[PDB]
């Protein structure tokens, strides 16, 4: 019942400001502490700050005491990180972890999903979704493999589901790639050898630019 | 925010029984720890027992000075702490304070004031309050000093004040001293230079074993 839900992903131009929330639920926000951790892309987990949700008193790690405002809104059981004058390094996935007492010492028991703050001047530009059927190659023997290709989009978070819940099969969603400040990603689904092509497999594509293209693949 | 009011101190026969309470006002934590600490010049400040309610858990703990003589309890529904100390010996005399802190890495603990606990065969003796007043003598510095003696009372707590707290400047309440199983002390007030001393300037002494007093002067 206990879960920490954060803000959605954010794109911000350098110099700008951002505020990310991290709401509690299933438990009382004021009896346990909270940490903000950061993970630079590819890179590792770095501890930012810690905060007593009761007195609203934070302790920043030195590398974050400056243009970093860790606040909180107790009534609604949510914490907030404020970031001013964003910069190249400010791109990373930011995490809230609950501080718990266990056996004389503390540990961050319940972590939040993460948040992607991406700083760029490159304008948001909605993706094209192309269904990939294999037709005229009779790639029919053992099993069949279809694929989706989503080209040219920005920022990086896109949700690629197949028939919303076909994933039980061999879905392979490959990480995106950055060329000329655009993004490219593709998924592959391997379906029942000789048996499913008689039933529609659709490529579902959601992207926070209110774009939603569900491109079915015939053939 | 949090407010800690404790009560229950007194004089008891060695081998006898004592029970101290502590009420946590505006203390709404579900996960915290409560401890009892004691103080006496025979040994300074020393920890005695700790109870802790961490989600699903009441884990109490004690030391040498109490293993088997004292026990911690915690049940109003959610406010009071109980130190049940029995089989009390002569070295258990001190003032006891409840200390508290919610389970946070960084946190300030809350402390109460404490209640004195005296363990003896000596019975309670009330204080004899004697008013002090010069004559011609004490015309030393330019101001007006007159006092109040407090004779051989037994259990140590006491509250000597003046005009019930009206004139609280230039007061000097001295520490109690001990001559043969009995205590004594004096307070001093140095009221305004001129000759307004001795009347409607009252010495009120409070001594918990049912003896309160308001005394006069020359």
């Amino acid at each position: 019942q206990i879960q920490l839900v954060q803000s959605g992903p954010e794109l911000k131009k350098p110099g700008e400001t951002v505020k990310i929330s991290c709401k509690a639920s299933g438990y009382t926000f004021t009896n346990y502490g909270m940490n903000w951790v950061k993970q630079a892309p590819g890179k590792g987990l770095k501890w930012m700050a810690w905060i007593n949700t009761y007195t609203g008193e934070p302790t920043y790690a030195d590398d974050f005491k400056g243009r970093f405002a860790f606040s909180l809104e107790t009534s609604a059981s949510t914490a907030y990180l404020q970031i001013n004058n964003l910069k190249n390094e400010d791109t990373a996935t930011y995490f809230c972890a609950r501080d718990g007492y266990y056996e004389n010492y503390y540990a961050m028991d319940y972590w939040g999903q993460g948040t992607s703050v991406t700083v760029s001047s490159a304008k948001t530009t909605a993706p094209s979704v192309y269904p990939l059927a294999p037709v005229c190659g009779d790639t029919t023997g053992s099993s069949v493999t279809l694929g989706c290709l989503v080209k040219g989009y920005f920022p990086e978070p896109v949700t690629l589901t197949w028939n919303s819940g076909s994933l039980s099969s061999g879905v392979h969603t490959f990480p995106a790639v950055l060329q000329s400040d655009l993004y490219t990603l593709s998924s592959s689904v391997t379906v029942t050898s000789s048996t499913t092509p008689s039933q529609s497999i659709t490529c579902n594509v959601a992207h926070p630019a209110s774009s939603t293209k569900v491109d079915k693949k015939i053939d | 925010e949090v407010k800690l009011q404790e009560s229950g101190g007194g004089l008891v026969q060695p081998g006898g029984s004592m029970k101290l309470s502590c009420v946590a006002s505006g203390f709404t934590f579900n996960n915290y720890w409560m401890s009892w600490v004691r103080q006496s010049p025979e040994k300074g400040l020393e920890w005695v027992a700790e109870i802790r309610l961490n989600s699903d858990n009441f884990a109490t703990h004690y030391a040498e000075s109490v293993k088997g003589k004292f026990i911690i309890s915690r049940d109003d529904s959610k406010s009071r702490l109980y130190l049940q100390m029995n089989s009390l010996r002569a070295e258990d005399t001190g003032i006891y304070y409840c200390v508290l802190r919610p389970l946070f890495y960084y946190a300030v603990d809350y402390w109460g004031q404490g209640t004195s606990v005296t363990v003896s065969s000596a019975k309670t003796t009330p204080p004899s309050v004697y008013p002090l007043a010069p004559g011609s003598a004490a015309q030393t510095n330019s101001m007006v000093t007159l006092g109040c003696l407090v004779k051989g009372y037994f259990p140590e707590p006491v509250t000597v004040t003046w005009n019930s707290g009206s004139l609280s400047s230039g007061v000097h309440t001295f520490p109690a001293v001990l001559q043969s199983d009995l205590y004594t002390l004096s307070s001093s007030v140095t009221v305004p230079s001129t000759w307004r001393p001795s009347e409607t300037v009252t010495c009120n002494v409070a001594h918990p074993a049912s003896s309160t007093k308001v005394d006069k002067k020359i």
């Binding site: 995490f95 269904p131 490219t184 | -």
Partner: protein, 214 residues
């Protein structure tokens, strides 16, 4: 500040085997050490708190040792799922120093990849682009030499590859390779080959097609 240094950054170990991860503190931090595990994409979970006590939900597989300056985490018998970066974290003094992590690369038996070459979508070419993609699925070892060939020799520019980290269900890698031409460049060429050169076959897997109409 207090430096947490992890002995080995990459760690390769076969299913059913035992691997112990060491982690050192620069100044005694007593048993206030915790191990978190991070699977790709998803967020990190607590595994071993207070340097020796397992957290709820975690199995008896995952263990920990540690005292003052030296700490260890041992997965007694590894599985296809235990793929991640395991970090240690001190929570004694102010700056909660973290260690670098340790990725586990499960060693396994070689496997040639299922290959699929896809011709550009109808909708795509009308819009101007002509992206041919090739999926080289479920292989092992990691390195694969993808190579295209259009109308004869190979094309070097226009391409952009992509990988997934060891698949958690069979410890296998997979990769996408996309070549992007413009509708123009595309109608000037008829034959296209996806060329997977790779370790488990002295001879390459070749998937191809040439401009048909289906």
């Amino acid at each position: 500040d207090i430096v947490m240094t992890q002995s080995h950054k990459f760690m390769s170990t076969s299913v059913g085997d035992r691997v112990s991860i060491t982690c050192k503190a620069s100044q005694d931090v007593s048993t206030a050490v915790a191990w978190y595990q991070q699977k790709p994409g998803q967020s990190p979970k607590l595994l071993i708190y207070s340097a020796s006590y397992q957290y709820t939900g975690v199995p008896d597989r995952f263990t920990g040792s540690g005292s003052r300056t030296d700490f260890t985490f041992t997965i007694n018998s590894v599985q296809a799922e235990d793929l991640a970066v395991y970090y240690c974290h001190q929570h004694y003094s102010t700056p909660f120093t973290f260690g670098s992590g340790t990725k586990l690369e499960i060693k396994r038996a070689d496997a040639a990849p299922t290959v699929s070459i896809f011709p550009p979508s109808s909708e795509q070419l009308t819009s101007g682009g002509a992206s041919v993609v090739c999926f080289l699925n479920n292989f092992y070892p990691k390195d694969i030499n993808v190579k295209w060939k259009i109308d004869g020799s190979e094309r070097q520019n226009g391409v952009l590859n992509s990988w997934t980290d060891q698949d958690s269900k069979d410890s296998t890698y997979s990769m996408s390779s996309t070549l992007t031409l413009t509708k123009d460049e595309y109608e000037r060429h008829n034959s296209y080959t996806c060329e997977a050169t790779h370790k488990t076959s002295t001879s390459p897997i070749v998937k191809s097609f040439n401009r048909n109409e289906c």
